[PDB]
């Protein structure tokens, strides 16, 4: 019990192995490359811990995911399996067995956005007080794949020569379509768009107005 390391010595050296974390390099919608340089490398060094987590409410210093780099010779690594279009917080520290060095500076990097992988929810078409009001709610946050920049509304007549398109910003959840040609069934679909493009369209809601401008149900047609 007399020929091991001096923990005070190991802790000091490890603490002095200053890990300088560079600006992360975003590789894809689900991966980010981290790179670092170490000044005054410790003579006790097993590797590095890369701590990372998405933006959002968290529970402090214990609330991180950990990617363990098990060799001191590496100066970079790819963090895979990340949420799409999400801002990440990243830091790194050297370690040697049970001992850990000091955390690097904190860095932030956002994975690449993709088009939303789910449609807007609750798409509804209503007579507006020959105009209709189209209303919806955003796709589930976890399907958005980034910040929603706008919503695209398509209003397509059964006779496709009749069509109307509308764009509203990402904080707008309804839009008025002023005029529909009476007697024509229109299909209404909405898609959310991030910076990476338009996502999946909602399955169509149908509406047809009579000459008075009032909705005629499918049931009422066959009459």
PDB file of C-alpha atoms in Angstrom:
ATOM      1  CA  UNK A   1       0.000   0.000   0.000  1.00  0.00           C
ATOM      2  CA  UNK A   2       3.021   2.270  -0.435  1.00  0.00           C
ATOM      3  CA  UNK A   3       3.993   2.382  -4.124  1.00  0.00           C
ATOM      4  CA  UNK A   4       1.067   4.026  -5.909  1.00  0.00           C
ATOM      5  CA  UNK A   5       0.398   7.523  -7.219  1.00  0.00           C
ATOM      6  CA  UNK A   6       0.195  10.682  -5.129  1.00  0.00           C
ATOM      7  CA  UNK A   7      -3.417  11.747  -5.663  1.00  0.00           C
ATOM      8  CA  UNK A   8      -2.632  15.398  -4.921  1.00  0.00           C
ATOM      9  CA  UNK A   9       0.078  15.249  -7.586  1.00  0.00           C
ATOM     10  CA  UNK A  10      -2.147  13.542 -10.153  1.00  0.00           C
ATOM     11  CA  UNK A  11      -5.000  15.961  -9.493  1.00  0.00           C
ATOM     12  CA  UNK A  12      -2.735  18.983  -9.928  1.00  0.00           C
ATOM     13  CA  UNK A  13      -1.128  17.790 -13.171  1.00  0.00           C
ATOM     14  CA  UNK A  14      -4.482  16.757 -14.594  1.00  0.00           C
ATOM     15  CA  UNK A  15      -5.923  20.130 -13.621  1.00  0.00           C
ATOM     16  CA  UNK A  16      -3.090  21.853 -15.473  1.00  0.00           C
ATOM     17  CA  UNK A  17      -3.648  19.952 -18.708  1.00  0.00           C
ATOM     18  CA  UNK A  18      -5.528  22.883 -20.211  1.00  0.00           C
ATOM     19  CA  UNK A  19      -7.952  21.684 -22.871  1.00  0.00           C
ATOM     20  CA  UNK A  20      -8.732  24.464 -25.345  1.00  0.00           C
ATOM     21  CA  UNK A  21     -11.943  23.559 -27.141  1.00  0.00           C
ATOM     22  CA  UNK A  22     -12.183  25.023 -30.635  1.00  0.00           C
ATOM     23  CA  UNK A  23     -15.391  26.057 -32.384  1.00  0.00           C
ATOM     24  CA  UNK A  24     -17.256  22.809 -33.146  1.00  0.00           C
ATOM     25  CA  UNK A  25     -17.632  21.806 -36.785  1.00  0.00           C
ATOM     26  CA  UNK A  26     -21.178  20.849 -37.721  1.00  0.00           C
ATOM     27  CA  UNK A  27     -21.095  17.828 -40.035  1.00  0.00           C
ATOM     28  CA  UNK A  28     -24.747  16.875 -40.526  1.00  0.00           C
ATOM     29  CA  UNK A  29     -28.235  17.138 -39.067  1.00  0.00           C
ATOM     30  CA  UNK A  30     -27.214  14.556 -36.457  1.00  0.00           C
ATOM     31  CA  UNK A  31     -23.461  14.944 -35.907  1.00  0.00           C
ATOM     32  CA  UNK A  32     -20.912  17.538 -34.795  1.00  0.00           C
ATOM     33  CA  UNK A  33     -17.128  17.293 -34.840  1.00  0.00           C
ATOM     34  CA  UNK A  34     -15.284  18.519 -31.761  1.00  0.00           C
ATOM     35  CA  UNK A  35     -11.577  19.415 -31.793  1.00  0.00           C
ATOM     36  CA  UNK A  36      -9.205  20.509 -29.034  1.00  0.00           C
ATOM     37  CA  UNK A  37      -5.610  21.342 -28.205  1.00  0.00           C
ATOM     38  CA  UNK A  38      -3.900  20.625 -24.905  1.00  0.00           C
ATOM     39  CA  UNK A  39      -1.239  22.878 -23.436  1.00  0.00           C
ATOM     40  CA  UNK A  40       0.917  21.302 -20.727  1.00  0.00           C
ATOM     41  CA  UNK A  41      -0.306  17.734 -21.211  1.00  0.00           C
ATOM     42  CA  UNK A  42      -0.506  15.715 -17.988  1.00  0.00           C
ATOM     43  CA  UNK A  43       1.870  12.805 -17.435  1.00  0.00           C
ATOM     44  CA  UNK A  44      -1.221  11.106 -16.028  1.00  0.00           C
ATOM     45  CA  UNK A  45      -3.739  11.037 -18.859  1.00  0.00           C
ATOM     46  CA  UNK A  46      -6.066   8.278 -20.016  1.00  0.00           C
ATOM     47  CA  UNK A  47      -8.208  10.328 -22.386  1.00  0.00           C
ATOM     48  CA  UNK A  48     -10.957  12.934 -22.553  1.00  0.00           C
ATOM     49  CA  UNK A  49     -14.605  13.240 -21.601  1.00  0.00           C
ATOM     50  CA  UNK A  50     -16.745  15.192 -24.053  1.00  0.00           C
ATOM     51  CA  UNK A  51     -19.888  16.453 -22.349  1.00  0.00           C
ATOM     52  CA  UNK A  52     -22.813  17.590 -24.464  1.00  0.00           C
ATOM     53  CA  UNK A  53     -26.539  18.266 -24.363  1.00  0.00           C
ATOM     54  CA  UNK A  54     -29.315  19.960 -26.338  1.00  0.00           C
ATOM     55  CA  UNK A  55     -30.568  23.434 -25.507  1.00  0.00           C
ATOM     56  CA  UNK A  56     -33.546  23.562 -23.163  1.00  0.00           C
ATOM     57  CA  UNK A  57     -34.213  23.338 -19.442  1.00  0.00           C
ATOM     58  CA  UNK A  58     -31.562  21.246 -17.700  1.00  0.00           C
ATOM     59  CA  UNK A  59     -30.569  20.205 -14.187  1.00  0.00           C
ATOM     60  CA  UNK A  60     -27.098  21.743 -14.061  1.00  0.00           C
ATOM     61  CA  UNK A  61     -23.627  20.220 -14.065  1.00  0.00           C
ATOM     62  CA  UNK A  62     -24.828  16.634 -13.691  1.00  0.00           C
ATOM     63  CA  UNK A  63     -27.204  16.915 -16.634  1.00  0.00           C
ATOM     64  CA  UNK A  64     -24.926  16.085 -19.581  1.00  0.00           C
ATOM     65  CA  UNK A  65     -24.452  13.245 -22.032  1.00  0.00           C
ATOM     66  CA  UNK A  66     -20.866  11.967 -22.056  1.00  0.00           C
ATOM     67  CA  UNK A  67     -18.711  10.803 -24.964  1.00  0.00           C
ATOM     68  CA  UNK A  68     -15.549   9.146 -23.653  1.00  0.00           C
ATOM     69  CA  UNK A  69     -12.382   9.394 -25.753  1.00  0.00           C
ATOM     70  CA  UNK A  70     -10.220   6.619 -24.359  1.00  0.00           C
ATOM     71  CA  UNK A  71      -6.874   7.732 -25.755  1.00  0.00           C
ATOM     72  CA  UNK A  72      -4.969  10.959 -25.042  1.00  0.00           C
ATOM     73  CA  UNK A  73      -3.563  10.964 -28.585  1.00  0.00           C
ATOM     74  CA  UNK A  74      -6.837  12.019 -30.231  1.00  0.00           C
ATOM     75  CA  UNK A  75      -7.441  15.742 -30.708  1.00  0.00           C
ATOM     76  CA  UNK A  76     -10.912  15.430 -32.235  1.00  0.00           C
ATOM     77  CA  UNK A  77     -13.982  13.202 -32.309  1.00  0.00           C
ATOM     78  CA  UNK A  78     -17.400  13.105 -33.945  1.00  0.00           C
ATOM     79  CA  UNK A  79     -20.474  13.274 -31.729  1.00  0.00           C
ATOM     80  CA  UNK A  80     -23.175  11.272 -33.545  1.00  0.00           C
ATOM     81  CA  UNK A  81     -26.864  10.532 -33.014  1.00  0.00           C
ATOM     82  CA  UNK A  82     -27.861  14.131 -32.272  1.00  0.00           C
ATOM     83  CA  UNK A  83     -31.304  15.738 -32.609  1.00  0.00           C
ATOM     84  CA  UNK A  84     -31.856  17.385 -35.992  1.00  0.00           C
ATOM     85  CA  UNK A  85     -31.722  21.177 -36.198  1.00  0.00           C
ATOM     86  CA  UNK A  86     -30.973  21.529 -32.486  1.00  0.00           C
ATOM     87  CA  UNK A  87     -28.567  23.792 -30.605  1.00  0.00           C
ATOM     88  CA  UNK A  88     -26.003  21.881 -28.569  1.00  0.00           C
ATOM     89  CA  UNK A  89     -23.887  22.862 -25.595  1.00  0.00           C
ATOM     90  CA  UNK A  90     -20.481  21.182 -25.517  1.00  0.00           C
ATOM     91  CA  UNK A  91     -17.511  21.023 -23.155  1.00  0.00           C
ATOM     92  CA  UNK A  92     -14.554  18.707 -22.580  1.00  0.00           C
ATOM     93  CA  UNK A  93     -12.161  17.670 -19.825  1.00  0.00           C
ATOM     94  CA  UNK A  94      -9.111  15.416 -19.530  1.00  0.00           C
ATOM     95  CA  UNK A  95      -9.257  12.427 -17.207  1.00  0.00           C
ATOM     96  CA  UNK A  96      -7.033   9.743 -15.711  1.00  0.00           C
ATOM     97  CA  UNK A  97      -8.823   6.836 -14.081  1.00  0.00           C
ATOM     98  CA  UNK A  98     -10.928   8.279 -11.253  1.00  0.00           C
ATOM     99  CA  UNK A  99      -9.451  11.781 -11.574  1.00  0.00           C
ATOM    100  CA  UNK A 100     -10.839  14.529 -13.805  1.00  0.00           C
ATOM    101  CA  UNK A 101      -9.283  17.760 -15.037  1.00  0.00           C
ATOM    102  CA  UNK A 102     -10.986  21.129 -15.401  1.00  0.00           C
ATOM    103  CA  UNK A 103     -13.729  21.751 -17.954  1.00  0.00           C
ATOM    104  CA  UNK A 104     -12.812  23.547 -21.163  1.00  0.00           C
ATOM    105  CA  UNK A 105     -14.649  26.670 -22.247  1.00  0.00           C
ATOM    106  CA  UNK A 106     -18.288  26.028 -23.142  1.00  0.00           C
ATOM    107  CA  UNK A 107     -19.064  25.937 -26.865  1.00  0.00           C
ATOM    108  CA  UNK A 108     -22.373  26.015 -28.720  1.00  0.00           C
ATOM    109  CA  UNK A 109     -23.194  24.547 -32.125  1.00  0.00           C
ATOM    110  CA  UNK A 110     -26.416  23.719 -33.940  1.00  0.00           C
ATOM    111  CA  UNK A 111     -26.905  20.555 -35.961  1.00  0.00           C
ATOM    112  CA  UNK A 112     -28.081  21.100 -39.525  1.00  0.00           C
ATOM    113  CA  UNK A 113     -31.816  21.610 -39.933  1.00  0.00           C
ATOM    114  CA  UNK A 114     -33.980  19.388 -42.098  1.00  0.00           C
ATOM    115  CA  UNK A 115     -37.467  19.878 -43.491  1.00  0.00           C
ATOM    116  CA  UNK A 116     -40.133  19.033 -40.890  1.00  0.00           C
ATOM    117  CA  UNK A 117     -40.852  15.283 -40.951  1.00  0.00           C
ATOM    118  CA  UNK A 118     -44.486  15.658 -39.859  1.00  0.00           C
ATOM    119  CA  UNK A 119     -47.384  17.847 -41.068  1.00  0.00           C
ATOM    120  CA  UNK A 120     -49.011  20.737 -39.185  1.00  0.00           C
ATOM    121  CA  UNK A 121     -51.714  19.444 -36.830  1.00  0.00           C
ATOM    122  CA  UNK A 122     -55.469  19.943 -36.676  1.00  0.00           C
ATOM    123  CA  UNK A 123     -55.780  21.484 -40.121  1.00  0.00           C
ATOM    124  CA  UNK A 124     -59.296  22.903 -40.259  1.00  0.00           C
ATOM    125  CA  UNK A 125     -61.244  24.673 -42.983  1.00  0.00           C
ATOM    126  CA  UNK A 126     -64.196  26.872 -42.080  1.00  0.00           C
ATOM    127  CA  UNK A 127     -66.497  29.341 -43.748  1.00  0.00           C
ATOM    128  CA  UNK A 128     -65.063  32.751 -42.897  1.00  0.00           C
ATOM    129  CA  UNK A 129     -67.297  35.493 -41.496  1.00  0.00           C
ATOM    130  CA  UNK A 130     -67.069  33.178 -50.566  1.00  0.00           C
ATOM    131  CA  UNK A 131     -64.049  33.116 -48.256  1.00  0.00           C
ATOM    132  CA  UNK A 132     -62.711  30.376 -45.997  1.00  0.00           C
ATOM    133  CA  UNK A 133     -60.410  30.468 -42.988  1.00  0.00           C
ATOM    134  CA  UNK A 134     -57.722  27.794 -42.839  1.00  0.00           C
ATOM    135  CA  UNK A 135     -56.322  27.086 -39.372  1.00  0.00           C
ATOM    136  CA  UNK A 136     -53.690  24.718 -37.986  1.00  0.00           C
ATOM    137  CA  UNK A 137     -51.188  24.100 -35.212  1.00  0.00           C
ATOM    138  CA  UNK A 138     -47.445  23.465 -35.537  1.00  0.00           C
ATOM    139  CA  UNK A 139     -46.106  19.924 -36.017  1.00  0.00           C
ATOM    140  CA  UNK A 140     -44.845  18.167 -32.870  1.00  0.00           C
ATOM    141  CA  UNK A 141     -41.723  20.038 -31.740  1.00  0.00           C
ATOM    142  CA  UNK A 142     -39.603  16.884 -32.064  1.00  0.00           C
ATOM    143  CA  UNK A 143     -40.526  16.513 -35.739  1.00  0.00           C
ATOM    144  CA  UNK A 144     -39.799  20.093 -36.782  1.00  0.00           C
ATOM    145  CA  UNK A 145     -36.070  19.458 -37.352  1.00  0.00           C
ATOM    146  CA  UNK A 146     -35.290  23.131 -36.833  1.00  0.00           C
ATOM    147  CA  UNK A 147     -36.939  26.516 -36.424  1.00  0.00           C
ATOM    148  CA  UNK A 148     -40.192  26.813 -38.370  1.00  0.00           C
ATOM    149  CA  UNK A 149     -39.799  29.815 -40.667  1.00  0.00           C
ATOM    150  CA  UNK A 150     -43.188  29.721 -42.371  1.00  0.00           C
ATOM    151  CA  UNK A 151     -46.283  27.744 -43.313  1.00  0.00           C
ATOM    152  CA  UNK A 152     -47.279  27.036 -46.891  1.00  0.00           C
ATOM    153  CA  UNK A 153     -51.000  26.640 -47.558  1.00  0.00           C
ATOM    154  CA  UNK A 154     -52.157  24.993 -50.783  1.00  0.00           C
ATOM    155  CA  UNK A 155     -55.773  25.254 -51.940  1.00  0.00           C
ATOM    156  CA  UNK A 156     -56.246  23.041 -55.007  1.00  0.00           C
ATOM    157  CA  UNK A 157     -59.468  22.745 -56.995  1.00  0.00           C
ATOM    158  CA  UNK A 158     -60.586  19.356 -58.278  1.00  0.00           C
ATOM    159  CA  UNK A 159     -60.179  21.077 -61.618  1.00  0.00           C
ATOM    160  CA  UNK A 160     -56.503  21.841 -61.076  1.00  0.00           C
ATOM    161  CA  UNK A 161     -56.651  25.065 -63.098  1.00  0.00           C
ATOM    162  CA  UNK A 162     -58.220  26.453 -59.926  1.00  0.00           C
ATOM    163  CA  UNK A 163     -55.584  26.856 -57.235  1.00  0.00           C
ATOM    164  CA  UNK A 164     -54.480  29.288 -54.543  1.00  0.00           C
ATOM    165  CA  UNK A 165     -51.269  29.387 -52.524  1.00  0.00           C
ATOM    166  CA  UNK A 166     -50.534  31.321 -49.344  1.00  0.00           C
ATOM    167  CA  UNK A 167     -47.458  31.790 -47.187  1.00  0.00           C
ATOM    168  CA  UNK A 168     -47.519  33.028 -43.601  1.00  0.00           C
ATOM    169  CA  UNK A 169     -44.697  33.345 -41.077  1.00  0.00           C
ATOM    170  CA  UNK A 170     -43.835  30.699 -38.491  1.00  0.00           C
ATOM    171  CA  UNK A 171     -45.879  32.406 -35.780  1.00  0.00           C
ATOM    172  CA  UNK A 172     -49.064  32.571 -37.848  1.00  0.00           C
ATOM    173  CA  UNK A 173     -51.528  29.702 -37.601  1.00  0.00           C
ATOM    174  CA  UNK A 174     -54.445  30.692 -39.820  1.00  0.00           C
ATOM    175  CA  UNK A 175     -55.027  32.384 -43.159  1.00  0.00           C
ATOM    176  CA  UNK A 176     -58.005  33.634 -45.142  1.00  0.00           C
ATOM    177  CA  UNK A 177     -58.554  32.404 -48.678  1.00  0.00           C
ATOM    178  CA  UNK A 178     -60.703  35.238 -50.106  1.00  0.00           C
ATOM    179  CA  UNK A 179     -62.428  33.541 -53.030  1.00  0.00           C
ATOM    180  CA  UNK A 180     -63.312  30.011 -54.073  1.00  0.00           C
ATOM    181  CA  UNK A 181     -65.099  29.222 -57.322  1.00  0.00           C
ATOM    182  CA  UNK A 182     -68.535  27.928 -56.267  1.00  0.00           C
ATOM    183  CA  UNK A 183     -69.299  24.341 -57.265  1.00  0.00           C
ATOM    184  CA  UNK A 184     -65.638  23.323 -57.166  1.00  0.00           C
ATOM    185  CA  UNK A 185     -64.298  21.048 -54.445  1.00  0.00           C
ATOM    186  CA  UNK A 186     -61.018  22.400 -53.105  1.00  0.00           C
ATOM    187  CA  UNK A 187     -58.323  20.394 -51.366  1.00  0.00           C
ATOM    188  CA  UNK A 188     -56.543  22.245 -48.565  1.00  0.00           C
ATOM    189  CA  UNK A 189     -53.105  21.167 -47.351  1.00  0.00           C
ATOM    190  CA  UNK A 190     -50.527  22.840 -45.121  1.00  0.00           C
ATOM    191  CA  UNK A 191     -46.803  22.286 -44.685  1.00  0.00           C
ATOM    192  CA  UNK A 192     -44.356  23.713 -42.166  1.00  0.00           C
ATOM    193  CA  UNK A 193     -41.043  25.018 -43.512  1.00  0.00           C
ATOM    194  CA  UNK A 194     -37.703  25.326 -41.762  1.00  0.00           C
ATOM    195  CA  UNK A 195     -34.605  26.865 -43.313  1.00  0.00           C
ATOM    196  CA  UNK A 196     -33.957  23.439 -44.814  1.00  0.00           C
ATOM    197  CA  UNK A 197     -37.201  23.355 -46.789  1.00  0.00           C
ATOM    198  CA  UNK A 198     -40.894  22.489 -46.805  1.00  0.00           C
ATOM    199  CA  UNK A 199     -41.927  19.478 -44.735  1.00  0.00           C
ATOM    200  CA  UNK A 200     -44.633  16.888 -45.313  1.00  0.00           C
ATOM    201  CA  UNK A 201     -48.032  18.270 -46.298  1.00  0.00           C
ATOM    202  CA  UNK A 202     -51.076  17.499 -44.175  1.00  0.00           C
ATOM    203  CA  UNK A 203     -53.553  15.099 -45.752  1.00  0.00           C
ATOM    204  CA  UNK A 204     -56.194  17.199 -47.512  1.00  0.00           C
ATOM    205  CA  UNK A 205     -59.218  18.842 -45.959  1.00  0.00           C
ATOM    206  CA  UNK A 206     -61.989  19.331 -48.514  1.00  0.00           C
ATOM    207  CA  UNK A 207     -64.349  22.247 -48.945  1.00  0.00           C
ATOM    208  CA  UNK A 208     -66.852  23.282 -51.582  1.00  0.00           C
ATOM    209  CA  UNK A 209     -69.011  26.405 -51.513  1.00  0.00           C
ATOM    210  CA  UNK A 210     -72.376  26.957 -53.183  1.00  0.00           C
ATOM    211  CA  UNK A 211     -73.410  30.096 -55.077  1.00  0.00           C
ATOM    212  CA  UNK A 212     -74.334  31.767 -51.787  1.00  0.00           C
ATOM    213  CA  UNK A 213     -70.776  31.165 -50.613  1.00  0.00           C
ATOM    214  CA  UNK A 214     -71.805  28.548 -48.061  1.00  0.00           C
ATOM    215  CA  UNK A 215     -70.156  25.147 -47.531  1.00  0.00           C
ATOM    216  CA  UNK A 216     -71.857  22.186 -49.164  1.00  0.00           C
ATOM    217  CA  UNK A 217     -71.071  18.879 -47.489  1.00  0.00           C
ATOM    218  CA  UNK A 218     -70.328  15.726 -49.517  1.00  0.00           C
ATOM    219  CA  UNK A 219     -73.566  14.311 -48.101  1.00  0.00           C
ATOM    220  CA  UNK A 220     -75.488  17.302 -49.460  1.00  0.00           C
ATOM    221  CA  UNK A 221     -74.033  16.975 -52.968  1.00  0.00           C
ATOM    222  CA  UNK A 222     -75.840  13.745 -53.815  1.00  0.00           C
ATOM    223  CA  UNK A 223     -79.205  15.496 -53.495  1.00  0.00           C
TER     224      UNK A 223
END
